[PDB]
Amino acid sequence: LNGIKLGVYIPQEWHDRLMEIAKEKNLTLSDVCRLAIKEYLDNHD
Amino acid sequence: LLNGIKLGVYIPQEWHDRLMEIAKEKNLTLSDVCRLAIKEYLDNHD
């Protein structure tokens, strides 16, 4: 994407479970990452 | 090596500057805040 980069390290299995979701949905791992981010941010009004 | 793999995810500024603000109120790194944004998300896929 554009805008502001992230350089987070996460648990190896997490990644995988994020890579299998991204497959299943026809997204990339960034896409699904933004998904969880925006979903988090939505929780916090 | 608890953590380990790196992500590079290009996200809007708004999500960026705003995640930052949550961190400072939970006292966390910008990075903690995502780690759980992600974990919760992965939890909510059963």
Side-chain angles (χ1 to χ4, degrees), chain A residues 1-44, chain B residues 1-45:
Chain A
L1 250 60
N2 198 57
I4 305 214
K5 166 156 140 173
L6 287 178
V8 180
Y9 288 70
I10 44 143
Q12 242 165 106
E13 149 83 357
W14 279 34
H15 187 94
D16 313 351
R17 268 213 274 160
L18 277 162
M19 210 67 248
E20 318 259 66
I21 302 165
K23 284 179 93 50
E24 156 214 322
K25 269 184 136 343
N26 292 322
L27 306 163
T28 82
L29 167 106
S30 296
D31 295 315
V32 187
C33 280
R34 277 187 228 93
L35 176 39
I37 290 175
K38 169 61 161 165
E39 273 194 3
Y40 180 75
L41 280 171
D42 287 338
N43 308 335
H44 297 42
Chain B
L1 246 190
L2 160 137
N3 298 129
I5 332 200
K6 179 176 152 70
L7 309 195
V9 174
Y10 275 88
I11 69 170
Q13 267 244 68
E14 159 67 348
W15 299 14
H16 174 263
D17 305 346
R18 212 210 306 180
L19 288 159
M20 270 266 200
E21 312 217 327
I22 286 171
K24 284 299 166 88
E25 163 161 49
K26 316 213 87 69
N27 256 293
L28 300 157
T29 55
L30 162 51
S31 343
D32 300 318
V33 173
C34 292
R35 275 172 225 154
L36 57 130
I38 284 182
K39 170 66 174 198
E40 282 174 3
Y41 171 64
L42 293 171
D43 290 349
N44 319 347
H45 276 225

